[PDB]
Amino acid sequence: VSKHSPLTKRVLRSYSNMREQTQDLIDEVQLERIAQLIEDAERVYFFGTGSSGLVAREMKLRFMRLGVVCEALTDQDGFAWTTSIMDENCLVLGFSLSGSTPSILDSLLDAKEMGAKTVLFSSVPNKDSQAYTETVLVATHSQPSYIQRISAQLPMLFFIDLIYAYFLEINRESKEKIFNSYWENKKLNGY
Amino acid sequence: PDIATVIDSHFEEMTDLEQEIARYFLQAETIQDDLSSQQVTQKLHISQAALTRFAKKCGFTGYREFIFQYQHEAENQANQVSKHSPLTKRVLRSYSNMREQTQDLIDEVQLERIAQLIEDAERVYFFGTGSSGLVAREMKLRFMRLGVVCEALTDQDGFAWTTSIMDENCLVLGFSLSGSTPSILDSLLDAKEMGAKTVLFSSVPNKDSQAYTETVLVATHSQPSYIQRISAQLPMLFFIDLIYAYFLEINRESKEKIFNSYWENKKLNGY
Amino acid sequence: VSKHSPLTKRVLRSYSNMREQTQDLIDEVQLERIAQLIEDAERVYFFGTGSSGLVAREMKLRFMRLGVVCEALTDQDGFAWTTSIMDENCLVLGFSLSGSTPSILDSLLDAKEMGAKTVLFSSVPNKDSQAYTETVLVATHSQPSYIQRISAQLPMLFFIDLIYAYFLEINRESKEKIFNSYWENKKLNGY
Amino acid sequence: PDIATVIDSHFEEMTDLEQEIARYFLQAETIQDDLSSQQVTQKLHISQAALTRFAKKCGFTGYREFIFQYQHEAENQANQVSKHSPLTKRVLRSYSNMREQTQDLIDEVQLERIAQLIEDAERVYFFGTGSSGLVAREMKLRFMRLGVVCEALTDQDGFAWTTSIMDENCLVLGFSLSGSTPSILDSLLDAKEMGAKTVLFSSVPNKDSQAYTETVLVATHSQPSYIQRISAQLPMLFFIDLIYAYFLEINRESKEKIFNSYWENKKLNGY
Ligand SMILES: CC(=O)N[C@H]1[C@@H](O)[C@H](O)[C@@H](COP(=O)(O)O)O[C@@H]1O
Numbered sequence: 014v015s016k017h018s019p020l021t022k023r024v025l026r027s028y029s030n031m032r033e034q035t036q037d038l039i040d041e042v043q044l045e046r047i048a049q050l051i052e053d054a055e056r057v058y059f060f061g062t063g064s065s066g067l068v069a070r071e072m073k074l075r076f077m078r079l080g081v082v083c084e085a086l087t088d089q090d091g092f093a094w095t096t097s098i099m100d101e102n103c104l105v106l107g108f109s110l111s112g113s114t115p116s117i118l119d120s121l122l123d124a125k126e127m128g129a130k131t132v133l134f135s136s137v138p139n140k141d142s143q144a145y146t147e148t149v150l151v152a153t154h155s156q157p158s159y160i161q162r163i164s165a166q167l168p169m170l171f172f173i174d175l176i177y178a179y180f181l182e183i184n185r186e187s188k189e190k191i192f193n194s195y196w197e198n199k200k201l202n203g204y
Numbered sequence: 205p206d207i208a209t210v211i212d213s214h215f216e217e218m219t220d221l222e223q224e225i226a227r228y229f230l231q232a233e234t235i236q237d238d239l240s241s242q243q244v245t246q247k248l249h250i251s252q253a254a255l256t257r258f259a260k261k262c263g264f265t266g267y268r269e270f271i272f273q274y275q276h277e278a279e280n281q282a283n284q285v286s287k288h289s290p291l292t293k294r295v296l297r298s299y300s301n302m303r304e305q306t307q308d309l310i311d312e313v314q315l316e317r318i319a320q321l322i323e324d325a326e327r328v329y330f331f332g333t334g335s336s337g338l339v340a341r342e343m344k345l346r347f348m349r350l351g352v353v354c355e356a357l358t359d360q361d362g363f364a365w366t367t368s369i370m371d372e373n374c375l376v377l378g379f380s381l382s383g384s385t386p387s388i389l390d391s392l393l394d395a396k397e398m399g400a401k402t403v404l405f406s407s408v409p410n411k412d413s414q415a416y417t418e419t420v421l422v423a424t425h426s427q428p429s430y431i432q433r434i435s436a437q438l439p440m441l442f443f444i445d446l447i448y449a450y451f452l453e454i455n456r457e458s459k460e461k462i463f464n465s466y467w468e469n470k471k472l473n474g475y
Numbered sequence: 476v477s478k479h480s481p482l483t484k485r486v487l488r489s490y491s492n493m494r495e496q497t498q499d500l501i502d503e504v505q506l507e508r509i510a511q512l513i514e515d516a517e518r519v520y521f522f523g524t525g526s527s528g529l530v531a532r533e534m535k536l537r538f539m540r541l542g543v544v545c546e547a548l549t550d551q552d553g554f555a556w557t558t559s560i561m562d563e564n565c566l567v568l569g570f571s572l573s574g575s576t577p578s579i580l581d582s583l584l585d586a587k588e589m590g591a592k593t594v595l596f597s598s599v600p601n602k603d604s605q606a607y608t609e610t611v612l613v614a615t616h617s618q619p620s621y622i623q624r625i626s627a628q629l630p631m632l633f634f635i636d637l638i639y640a641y642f643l644e645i646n647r648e649s650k651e652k653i654f655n656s657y658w659e660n661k662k663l664n665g666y
Numbered sequence: 667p668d669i670a671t672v673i674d675s676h677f678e679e680m681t682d683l684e685q686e687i688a689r690y691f692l693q694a695e696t697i698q699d700d701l702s703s704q705q706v707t708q709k710l711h712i713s714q715a716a717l718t719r720f721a722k723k724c725g726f727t728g729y730r731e732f733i734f735q736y737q738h739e740a741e742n743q744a745n746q747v748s749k750h751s752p753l754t755k756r757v758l759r760s761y762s763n764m765r766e767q768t769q770d771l772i773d774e775v776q777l778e779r780i781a782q783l784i785e786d787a788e789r790v791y792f793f794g795t796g797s798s799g800l801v802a803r804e805m806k807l808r809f810m811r812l813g814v815v816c817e818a819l820t821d822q823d824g825f826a827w828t829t830s831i832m833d834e835n836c837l838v839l840g841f842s843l844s845g846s847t848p849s850i851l852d853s854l855l856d857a858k859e860m861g862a863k864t865v866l867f868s869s870v871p872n873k874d875s876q877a878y879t880e881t882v883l884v885a886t887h888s889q890p891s892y893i894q895r896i897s898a899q900l901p902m903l904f905f906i907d908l909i910y911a912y913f914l915e916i917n918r919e920s921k922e923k924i925f926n927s928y929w930e931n932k933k934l935n936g937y
């Protein structure tokens with residue numbers, strides 16, 4: 014009976030606490046370090062499932078537009094056939110909020126065995142995480158019950174946007190040129 | 205500047221009693237005890253006035269100020285920009301700005317009314333392109349687990365073939381942040397001509413909006429340039445999460461049962 | 476050194492033998508029977524993985540255009556959340572050329588337990604196939620080795636097109652109207 | 667009309683010997699024995715002329731005709747339209763017609779030349795919409811397991827962003843059956859202007875074709891009306907399967923190893 018209902022209040026609070034939490038978790042030298050891993054990589058891959066898969070889909074879109082040669086895969090067979098053709102010049106970002114999705118975990122090791130660098134985003138620390146090149150711990154939702162939780166993508170979209178910012182300032186002139194081409198008059202499939 | 209040093213500095217200025225109270229506060233473990241100016245006064249068998257005198261001898265206006273600084277020193281640590289990088293501060297302020305923006309835009313009776321439209325609908329459809337496509341896909345994933353019969357479409361061909369099999373019992377939620385994607389906008393009119401309810405999620409108050417059952421104004425990003433803009437999904441996820449919360453509380457017992465069926469032991473394709 | 480190379484010959488022969496084989500397998504009263512199951516169903520679903528998934532994708536496209544309310548799903552979680560909201564008025568077509576993909580098999584039973592009618596397309600007869608409402612045996616590829624085989628979709632696209640033909644002639648006037656709407660002048664998203 | 671009855675009918679017309687040969691052929695198990703007119707003549711200790719006389723007494727022009735009808739009766743069964751339904755005959759004739767059509771259109775040195783373009787390319791892309799999108803997706807799935815670095819795209823936004831990061835080392839295979847989908851056609855020119863090789867798969871000899879490194883004429887369907895047309899994928903799958911066969915035999919040892927890696931015991935995400 015005030016500016017907002019108890020339900021509108023609960024949602025907006027979960028968002029606020031996701032920003033406060035994410036702030037206390039930032040390891041800027043890691044986030045920047047990863048941003049450079051993308052640049053120095055021949056091919057980048059984003060593995061994810063469910064909502065963690067939608068997070069992988071957007072990242073492919075955003076970085077492709079900055080000139081990155083990348084793909085997003087969201088199913089086990091895609092991971093397995095993609096891993097079989099990886100090398101040391103590959104980088105894999107694995108998205109698993111629970112830190113337990115077997116397909117996501119096994120793929121990063123598969124990528125590790127083929128020589129590729131491996132990054133893991135998850136809200137739950139584990140010990141297999143040592144095996145990966147980096148492990149970015151994201152925020153945990155503030156709703157105890159799964160059903161009442163806000164979008165599962167958010168803990169990860171926070172750190173995607175930060176890595177995006179650190180990456181964009183690396184040789185930004187070239188990236189911003191590749192990005193504006195979408196609107197260019199010569200472009201025959203543009204806006 | 206340590207409050208432990210300040211009491212030690214003034215220890216030899218204090219009367220025989222105030223020197224005893226200094227001992228209490230100088231022990232590192234009193235920080236755990238209750239210090240509400242009555243539990244502390246009892247514990248030491250003293251008067252409040254006694255404690256107040258103690259405080260002013262250490263350099264404070266009263267007891268209330270002293271304990272305030274005394275306690276809060278346990279969590280003082282760093283209060284500057286630990287996240288120094290102004291680029292990091294740029295993203296985080298885009299996120300906070302968005303949430304603040306979102307708050308001002310909420311029409312709570314509209315959002316609930318959309319939540320109801322979803323329930324009464326037989327088939328719900330989500331239309332979106334690019335990043336707005338991911339938003340539509342997530343809404344399908346989230347509301348299907350509450351039992352909603354829905355589909356998510358992200359190409360023009362899909363919209364047209366989906367609109368051709370709609371009727372007055374369908375509902376179409378279209379997602380176009382700019383408010384100008386022709387396929388999304390022309391697909392809502394398509395659906396409306398078939399009798400379907402239509403909702404539009406966009407940050408731009410456009411005039412075509414009037415041709416839809418609902419039009420939800422989401423927030424604009426805070427970055428002038430597109431290239432620096434944070435994810436295009438969020439203006440919409442804010443409101444998606446709000447409609448989901450309203451919707452979830454409509455016949456919740458039913459929905460929670462369908463949502464938990466994913467983890468059912470009888471479920472042959474679950475966890 | 477003739478009209479065609481030994482390699483062009485091998486491919487075109489595998490196609491021919493796929494038509495000859497498919498012909499000897501047709502159970503017309505079954506194919507037509509299934510065509511009616513689609514009509515009498517409130518909601519139709521197509522489950523498939525890999526190339527069997529692409530076969531499910533096309534079928535959704537073709538039948539949706541005849542006015543069928545249908546969806547195609549190609550991953551385990553999609554199957555599981557879709558099955559949880561099925562009823563006796565649902566029909567599920569499951570596509571598994573090997574007849575062994577665990578996700579596909581378990582979903583049809585899941586659909587069976589929720590009351591939905593279940594159809595299975597596979598080139599290998601099994602005994603769990605008894606549990607399904609129908610079981611359409613398709614042709615087997617004529618190349619011994621997996622790698623040298625022609626497209627994995629074909630054994631199934633044969634029978635999709637036959638069921639499509641039997642279905643289209645059921646109340647064909649209504650379906651053909653729903654189909655031409657794509658090109659209609661009033662249609663605001665058309666051709 | 668049974669050949670067993672015919673010999674029985676004429677049994678009492680045959681000489682003492684021809685009645686013995688009737689016994690051989692009347693046994694149901696001789697059908698398994700060798701009957702090349704020399705193994706049969708040996709086995710019975712007879713001359714060929716003897717057998718020929720036997721045949722003409724049963725009603726045949728020679729021994730060769732008799733055994734021909736005699737043997738082939740084991741698999742005679744039904745030779746009419748078991749698949750009676752003329753609708754079923756409609757689909758099957760669309761399929762056969764397609765394969766026949768495809769044969770006449772094959773430019774074997776073009777198809778092999780495309781197979782080579784794929785090998786030399788660093789990044790391969792498949793563009794297609796609707797049913798032509800499924801064709802592009804399957805090609806990605808099939809050639810990735812031979813080690814090819816490839817991606818499949820099925821929306822306009824995807825084509826534009828993909829073309830902007832192409833160069834002279836890329837190859838784009840565009841799939842438009844009609845030969846007139848603007849997004850597919852304008853995306854090949856996009857790629858070409860970036861230096862990429864371009865291939866077009868379409869059934870319509872168009873003149874834009876001249877602006878591409880290759881243009882593959884696939885078959886037209888046999889059904890005038892679209893609604894009755896069988897799957898739109900096939901005209902292209904025919905040629906896809908042909909390019910795959912040519913491509914697979916380029917450095918096969920390497921490719922087969924990458925293909926079998928899916929079933930590797932060391933593979934941590936395989937079978
Ligand atoms: C508990 C639960 O409902 N999980 C679902 C999704 O919420 C999640 O996005 C997906 C990937 O999970 P992740 O790999 O841990 O991110 O798995 C499940 O489909």
Ligand SMILES: CC(=O)N[C@H]1[C@@H](O)[C@H](O)[C@@H](COP(=O)(O)O)O[C@@H]1O
Pocket residue numbers: 333334335336379380381382383384385388430436823
């Ligand atoms: C301005 C711009 O770059 N647009 C691109 C995406 O960022 C966007 O998500 C999509 C949908 O646009 P929307 O419908 O306005 O959300 O169109 C384009 O792909």
Ligand SMILES: CC(=O)N[C@H]1[C@@H](O)[C@H](O)[C@@H](COP(=O)(O)O)O[C@@H]1O
Pocket residue numbers: 090524525526527528570571572573574575576579621627
């Ligand atoms: C042996 C093999 O390589 N199988 C692959 C695909 O060819 C197949 O399409 C898919 C679904 O298989 P299905 O369910 O048997 O059709 O499984 C695998 O990804």
Ligand SMILES: CC(=O)N[C@H]1[C@@H](O)[C@H](O)[C@@H](COP(=O)(O)O)O[C@@H]1O
Pocket residue numbers: 361795796797798841842843844845846847850892898
């Ligand atoms: C005539 C027609 O109905 N076209 C539809 C589909 O059948 C087709 O697959 C797709 C690509 O068309 P293509 O590029 O000519 O193959 O466009 C439309 O979705």
Ligand SMILES: [Cl-]
Pocket residue numbers: 028029032299300303
């Ligand atoms: Cl905030």
Ligand SMILES: [Cl-]
Pocket residue numbers: 490491494761762765
């Ligand atoms: Cl044939």
Ligand code: NA
Pocket residue numbers: 027154155156161162163
């Ligand atoms: Na939450």
Ligand code: NA
Pocket residue numbers: 298425426427432433434
């Ligand atoms: Na922003």
Ligand code: NA
Pocket residue numbers: 489616617618623624625
């Ligand atoms: Na074959």
Ligand code: NA
Pocket residue numbers: 760887888889894895896
């Ligand atoms: Na045809």
